[PDB]
Motif scaffolding. Structure first.
Motif, PDB file in Angstrom:
ATOM      1  N   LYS A 100       0.835  -1.188   0.000  1.00 43.91           N
ATOM      2  CA  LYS A 100       0.000   0.000   0.000  1.00 43.91           C
ATOM      3  C   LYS A 100       0.875   1.245   0.000  1.00 43.91           C
ATOM      4  O   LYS A 100       1.995   1.238   0.515  1.00 43.91           O
ATOM      5  N   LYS A 101       0.358   2.313  -0.604  1.00 43.89           N
ATOM      6  CA  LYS A 101       1.095   3.567  -0.664  1.00 43.89           C
ATOM      7  C   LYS A 101       1.397   4.069   0.741  1.00 43.89           C
ATOM      8  O   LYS A 101       0.494   4.218   1.570  1.00 43.89           O
ATOM      9  N   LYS A 102       2.673   4.327   1.008  1.00 44.89           N
ATOM     10  CA  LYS A 102       3.138   4.750   2.319  1.00 44.89           C
ATOM     11  C   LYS A 102       3.867   6.080   2.200  1.00 44.89           C
ATOM     12  O   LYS A 102       4.626   6.299   1.251  1.00 44.89           O
ATOM     13  N   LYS A 103       3.622   6.969   3.163  1.00 45.94           N
ATOM     14  CA  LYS A 103       4.294   8.264   3.161  1.00 45.94           C
ATOM     15  C   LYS A 103       5.797   8.110   3.355  1.00 45.94           C
ATOM     16  O   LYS A 103       6.587   8.782   2.683  1.00 45.94           O
ATOM     17  N   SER A 104       6.210   7.229   4.263  1.00 46.69           N
ATOM     18  CA  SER A 104       7.614   7.028   4.583  1.00 46.69           C
ATOM     19  C   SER A 104       7.962   5.553   4.459  1.00 46.69           C
ATOM     20  O   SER A 104       7.218   4.686   4.928  1.00 46.69           O
ATOM     21  N   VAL A 105       9.107   5.280   3.839  1.00 46.93           N
ATOM     22  CA  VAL A 105       9.520   3.927   3.490  1.00 46.93           C
ATOM     23  C   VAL A 105      11.032   3.800   3.631  1.00 46.93           C
ATOM     24  O   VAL A 105      11.783   4.704   3.248  1.00 46.93           O
ATOM     25  N   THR A 106      11.475   2.678   4.199  1.00 46.37           N
ATOM     26  CA  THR A 106      12.886   2.385   4.392  1.00 46.37           C
ATOM     27  C   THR A 106      13.144   0.921   4.071  1.00 46.37           C
ATOM     28  O   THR A 106      12.278   0.066   4.268  1.00 46.37           O
ATOM     29  N   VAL A 107      14.345   0.636   3.574  1.00 47.12           N
ATOM     30  CA  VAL A 107      14.784  -0.726   3.294  1.00 47.12           C
ATOM     31  C   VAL A 107      16.104  -0.951   4.019  1.00 47.12           C
ATOM     32  O   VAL A 107      17.063  -0.200   3.815  1.00 47.12           O
ATOM     33  N   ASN A 174       4.605  -0.940  18.262  1.00 45.44           N
ATOM     34  CA  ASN A 174       4.425  -0.005  17.152  1.00 45.44           C
ATOM     35  C   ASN A 174       3.392  -0.577  16.190  1.00 45.44           C
ATOM     36  O   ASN A 174       3.730  -1.041  15.095  1.00 45.44           O
ATOM     37  N   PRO A 175       2.112  -0.564  16.575  1.00 42.38           N
ATOM     38  CA  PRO A 175       1.089  -1.214  15.740  1.00 42.38           C
ATOM     39  C   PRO A 175       0.876  -0.556  14.387  1.00 42.38           C
ATOM     40  O   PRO A 175       0.333  -1.208  13.486  1.00 42.38           O
ATOM     41  N   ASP A 176       1.277   0.701  14.207  1.00 45.10           N
ATOM     42  CA  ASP A 176       1.005   1.438  12.981  1.00 45.10           C
ATOM     43  C   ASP A 176       2.179   1.422  12.008  1.00 45.10           C
ATOM     44  O   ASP A 176       2.263   2.293  11.136  1.00 45.10           O
ATOM     45  N   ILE A 177       3.082   0.456  12.137  1.00 45.29           N
ATOM     46  CA  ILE A 177       4.262   0.357  11.287  1.00 45.29           C
ATOM     47  C   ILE A 177       4.217  -0.983  10.569  1.00 45.29           C
ATOM     48  O   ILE A 177       4.111  -2.034  11.213  1.00 45.29           O
ATOM     49  N   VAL A 178       4.298  -0.949   9.242  1.00 46.46           N
ATOM     50  CA  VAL A 178       4.286  -2.159   8.430  1.00 46.46           C
ATOM     51  C   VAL A 178       5.718  -2.637   8.254  1.00 46.46           C
ATOM     52  O   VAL A 178       6.589  -1.872   7.826  1.00 46.46           O
ATOM     53  N   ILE A 179       5.970  -3.901   8.582  1.00 45.22           N
ATOM     54  CA  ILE A 179       7.302  -4.485   8.481  1.00 45.22           C
ATOM     55  C   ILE A 179       7.200  -5.749   7.641  1.00 45.22           C
ATOM     56  O   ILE A 179       6.642  -6.757   8.091  1.00 45.22           O
ATOM     57  N   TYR A 180       7.736  -5.697   6.427  1.00 48.14           N
ATOM     58  CA  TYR A 180       7.872  -6.870   5.570  1.00 48.14           C
ATOM     59  C   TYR A 180       9.253  -7.464   5.806  1.00 48.14           C
ATOM     60  O   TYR A 180      10.267  -6.833   5.495  1.00 48.14           O
ATOM     61  N   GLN A 181       9.299  -8.672   6.355  1.00 45.46           N
ATOM     62  CA  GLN A 181      10.554  -9.339   6.669  1.00 45.46           C
ATOM     63  C   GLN A 181      10.730 -10.523   5.730  1.00 45.46           C
ATOM     64  O   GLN A 181       9.880 -11.419   5.693  1.00 45.46           O
ATOM     65  N   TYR A 182      11.824 -10.523   4.974  1.00 41.57           N
ATOM     66  CA  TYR A 182      12.160 -11.624   4.073  1.00 41.57           C
ATOM     67  C   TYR A 182      13.631 -11.956   4.293  1.00 41.57           C
ATOM     68  O   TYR A 182      14.511 -11.227   3.823  1.00 41.57           O
ATOM     69  N   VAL A 188      10.303  -1.292   5.902  1.00 39.49           N
ATOM     70  CA  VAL A 188       9.588  -0.611   6.974  1.00 39.49           C
ATOM     71  C   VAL A 188       8.819   0.552   6.371  1.00 39.49           C
ATOM     72  O   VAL A 188       9.417   1.467   5.795  1.00 39.49           O
ATOM     73  N   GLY A 189       7.500   0.523   6.513  1.00 40.57           N
ATOM     74  CA  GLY A 189       6.647   1.579   6.008  1.00 40.57           C
ATOM     75  C   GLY A 189       5.807   2.172   7.121  1.00 40.57           C
ATOM     76  O   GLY A 189       5.384   1.473   8.043  1.00 40.57           O
TER      77      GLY A 189
END
Lengths: 551, 388
Positions: A100-107, A174-182, A188-189
């Motif tokens: 989903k479109k996220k304002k802030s994104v980090t890899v 941090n319930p409002d932070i999306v973390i895709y772990q692979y 981190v969005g």
DNA sequence: ATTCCCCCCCTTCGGTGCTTTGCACCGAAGGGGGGG
């Protein structure tokens, strides 16, 4: 080191540790290996062992795509064979279309991942290896692993479990932070501004460092575009990393195999990719170095694929407040393309379906297979089934699924008028036709010599028999039906004793691997009305006395 | 109880999870989080090599999600009141939320592992194992069997006429009472169970075979009829087709009207009397397994046959009622409930559907707490409507 | 010359079942692509 609890790992019951001896290595490789072993020993990754360790494992070196650098690898094939089974928790590959479109994104990437998770104490002895005891004479020094080894089959699952255990408290707080772990890759969005997001990222980094995991700044991405999992991620769109097709002048089997693989990867976002004429060159040739000249059809497909792969094409992200729509198009020869989107002309993702299931099939069967594949793929990525736009008409689908003996279904869908349309090229009458000739057909082939005869008798004073060589009962029955179709008018009733031929014809195919069936199909389309009836094989019917004692 | 060892010389389940919708995933996460707090389940790691599928259903349309675990592979490796069939009404109650108070054997918990997936593979699947007796496993009613009698003794002796049968998580209460009195006793039984923690089998009718009745018969009509009797000869022998075959000699137009000879009407009528008979000699072998074939007759009509040996039908039926998969799924749940009441074993279905079609949608319309074993047929079984 | 785990497609081959001992379907393994 990571102060994380070790995972108890054992060997398969009744097994023992490996005892393989190390193959000789060149004097160039040994120096890099001993230097690496010394560094790892001083860092605590491995420990020197005495003569009490019977187990052993060969160790070699690889270029690491750096020439100067020499990565050390261990052939843990024996240990992997003797190691207990694990259940992989990685059920699939994340796709950017589901993001989903996220304002802030980090890899972020965790450096030296496997070397951070400790290995179970009892299992360390099996991982023992010895360094090629110098040119020779003096024994080599022998080491044993204290952390997760590279090349061991249990390393990925253990590291994934440890990463999940490390990350769960942070996600809980941090319930409002999306973390895709692979594996060791973190996406981190968050919807926070750049300052708050950067503050939270450093909080996560210190949380990982509390458990010994380190995140080097050379693998930390702070600005777009983000190179994530083979894709280029932008704030509002995504693309695959650039794809370079080969430009050979004399193709081989391996070159074509690599060419087809890249086209399948490109088909997820490039629409209209065809690989049918190119993959057909891989049939009948088994040598990986044999030179295959390009056919005329394959050359046409390659040019079209090159033209498609020239313009820039991008996808978009997923909005949960809108409905998913998947549109399907037919390209011929059992090939289909599809685009899944939410608003027109903005594809979430594209794809193709070209699987050839069954010896005899029609377009309506393949459309259902494509729909099912799209539904299954969409449930994985987004969790919901999209609404379909198919080139088949409602009445055609109604007739097919009402007259079909199997249970078939398609979810909510609507008709889109884009040719070519999906249709049934012929239909079998439910009742015999009045005034049309009746053809009692029969084909009998001798199994021993593979010779036979196929023939027919008719209501009028006509009768025909044709001899066939290198044939069987099924082929003779099909040829008898073909002869009945060949010499009849536009309306015909055909009575046959063969359940195989009736089962083949009744499914209404239009393509078939068998060449004889294709002729039958092309004859059936010419006819106006055709009735096909089954009769018992040897019960004295009119197609049993004058049709069996004949062909 | 305790030792629940597997059958000797085989391992535990290793089945994959298959994708789930995000509506069902949210239900499983909420359900499993609550069970973890109560100690019914606990998180495990990847060192456990066993896995069984899991999903959620909406049984009884109560808008409350229920967790279902596919223990079909664990049940195969673990190792009936005949008067219930003749009863008038069979009420089926759920006793699944009663095994949660019976701890499972510690050495057996590793085989009950299951994985909850995630949308877009955001995180590795969360794995759990069962600490108490699970629902859907064949050992749950067996270990709790000694505890059900203590709760059913004050009730069964009060009303001896009540017949109570327990299968999996379901209680089958059969009585010869009325529509209203049966319900009142059910409420008494329900409240009796709380202290310690709709079928009509009499209305079930076999589906016979019927020959078509015509005043004038054509060559095509006789040919179709001859095929029926020849096929029906294997099921009901004593069926002879000679005076009907004698009307199909010589090359004739398929629409030619054949006058039925006076001597041939006898065989047509005589075979009808043979056909209108319950073929005896079918005895349900308690050792063998039940097989249920299903055929799609079109126009929202399905026919099924339950047999242990080919051509020896134990039961024939017909289930009537846009959605073909939903209709087939409803038929499977209705046939299975019939077999449990009549024989006590779930059949082995041979569904007339594509394998990929079934696995995608069968979970959507499922509402039972048990899952039978099924196989997918591919050959076209439509040559004449033998079972119309 | 030598590793590991995961997803996908396309081709080949062996197994299984019904029947028509041939033919259709299916699953696993080889090649390739991608990720870590």
């Amino acid at each position: 080191i990571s102060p994380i609890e070790t995972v108890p790992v054992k060997l398969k019951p009744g097994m023992d540790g490996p005892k393989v001896k190390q193959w000789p290595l060149t004097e160039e490789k040994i120096k890099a290996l001993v230097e690496i072993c010394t560094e790892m020993e001083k860092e605590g990754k491995i420990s020197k062992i005495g003569p009490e360790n019977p187990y052993n494992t060969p160790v070699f070196a690889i270029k690491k795509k750096d020439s100067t650098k020499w990565r050390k690898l261990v052939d843990f094939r024996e240990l992997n064979k003797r190691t207990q089974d694990f259940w992989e928790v990685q059920l699939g590959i994340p796709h950017p279309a589901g993001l989903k479109k996220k304002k802030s994104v980090t890899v972020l990437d965790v450096g030296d991942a496997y070397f951070s998770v400790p290995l179970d104490e009892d299992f360390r002895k099996y991982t023992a290896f010895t360094i090629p005891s110098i040119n020779n004479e003096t024994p080599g020094i022998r080491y044993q692993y204290n952390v997760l080894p590279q090349g061991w089959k249990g390393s990925p699952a253990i590291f994934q479990s440890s990463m999940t255990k490390i990350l769960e408290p942070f996600k809980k707080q941090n319930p409002d932070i999306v973390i895709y772990q692979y594996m060791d890759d973190l996406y981190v969005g968050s919807d926070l501004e750049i300052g708050q997001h950067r503050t939270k990222i450093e909080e996560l980094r210190q949380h990982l460092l509390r458990w010994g995991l380190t995140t080097p700044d050379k693998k930390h991405q702070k600005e777009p575009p983000f190179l994530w999992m083979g894709y280029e991620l932008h704030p509002d769109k995504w693309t695959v990393q650039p794809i370079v097709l080969p430009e050979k002048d004399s193709w081989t089997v391996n070159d074509i195999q690599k060419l087809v693989g890249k086209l399948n990867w490109a088909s997820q976002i490039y629409p209209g990719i065809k690989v049918r004429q190119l993959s057909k060159l891989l049939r009948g040739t088994k040598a990986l170095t044999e030179v295959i000249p390009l056919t005329e059809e394959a050359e046409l497909e390659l040019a079209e694929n090159r033209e498609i792969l020239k313009e820039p094409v991008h996808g978009v992200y997923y909005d949960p407040s809108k409905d998913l729509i998947a549109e399907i198009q037919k390209q011929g020869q059992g090939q289909w393309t599809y685009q899944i989107y939410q608003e027109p002309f903005k594809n979430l993702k594209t794809g193709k379906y070209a699987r050839m299931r069954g010896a005899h099939t029609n377009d309506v069967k393949q459309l259902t297979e494509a729909v099912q594949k799209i539904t299954t793929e969409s449930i994985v990525i987004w969790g919901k089934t999209p609404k379909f736009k198919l080139p088949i008409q409602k009445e055609t689908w109604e007739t097919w699924w009402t007259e079909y003996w199997q249970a078939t279904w398609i979810p909510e869908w609507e008709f889109v008028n884009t040719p070519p349309l999906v249709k049934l090229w012929y239909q079998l009458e439910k009742e015999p036709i009045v005034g049309a000739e009746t053809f009692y057909v029969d084909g009998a082939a001798n199994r021993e010599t593979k010779l036979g005869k196929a023939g027919y008798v008719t209501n009028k004073g006509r009768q025909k028999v044709v001899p066939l060589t290198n044939t069987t009962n099924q082929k003779t029955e099909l040829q008898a039906i073909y002869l009945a179709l060949q010499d009849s008018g536009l309306e015909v009733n055909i009575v046959t004793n063969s359940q195989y031929a009736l089962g083949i014809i009744q499914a209404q195919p239009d393509k078939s691997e068998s060449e004889l069936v294709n002729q039958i199909i092309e004859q059936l389309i010419k006819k106006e009305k055709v009735y096909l009836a089954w009769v018992p094989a040897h019960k004295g019917i009119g197609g049993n006395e004058q049709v069996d004692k004949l062909v | 109880t305790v030792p629940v060892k597997l059958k000797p010389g085989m391992d535990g389940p290793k089945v994959k999870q298959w994708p789930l919708t995000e509506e069902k995933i949210k239900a499983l996460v909420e359900i499993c989080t609550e069970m973890e707090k109560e100690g019914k389940i606990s998180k495990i790691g990847p060192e456990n090599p066993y896995n069984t599928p899991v999903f959620a259903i909406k049984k009884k349309d109560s808008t409350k999600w229920r967790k279902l675990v596919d223990f079909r592979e664990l049940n195969k490796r673990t190792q009936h009141p005949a008067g219930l069939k003749k009863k008038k009404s069979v009420t089926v109650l759920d006793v699944g939320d009663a095994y949660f108070s019976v701890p499972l054997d510690e050495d057996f918990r590793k085989y009950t592992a299951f994985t909850i997936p995630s949308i877009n593979n955001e995180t590795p699947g969360i794995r759990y194992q069962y600490n108490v007796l699970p629902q859907g496993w064949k050992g749950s009613p067996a270990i709790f069997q000694s505890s059900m009698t203590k709760i059913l003794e004050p009730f069964k002796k009060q009303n001896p006429d009540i017949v109570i049968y327990q299968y999996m998580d379901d209680l089958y209460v059969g009585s010869d009472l009325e529509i209203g009195q049966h319900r009142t006793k059910i409420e008494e039984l329900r409240q009796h169970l709380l202290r310690w923690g709709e079928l009509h089998p009499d209305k079930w009718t076999v589906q016979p075979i019927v020959l078509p009745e015509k005043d004038s018969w054509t060559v095509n009509d006789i040919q179709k009829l001859v095929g029926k009797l020849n096929w029906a000869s294997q099921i009901y022998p004593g069926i002879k087709v000679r005076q009907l075959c004698k009307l199909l000699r010589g090359t004739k137009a398929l629409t030619e009207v054949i006058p039925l000879t006076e001597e041939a009407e006898l065989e047509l009528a005589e075979n009808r009397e043979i056909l209108k008979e319950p073929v005896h000699g079918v005895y349900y072998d308690p050792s063998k397994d039940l097989i249920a074939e299903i055929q799609k007759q079109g126009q929202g009509q399905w026919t099924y046959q339950i047999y242990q040996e080919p051509f020896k039908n134990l039961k024939t039926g017909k289930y009537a009622r846009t959605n073909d998969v939903k209709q087939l799924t409803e038929a499977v749940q209705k046939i299975t409930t019939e077999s449990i009441v009549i024989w006590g074993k779930t059949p082995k279905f041979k569904l007339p559907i594509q394998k990929e079609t079934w696995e995608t949608w069968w979970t959507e319309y499922w509402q039972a707490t048990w899952i039978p074993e099924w196989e997918f047929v591919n050959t076209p079984p439509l040559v004449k409507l033998w079972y119309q």
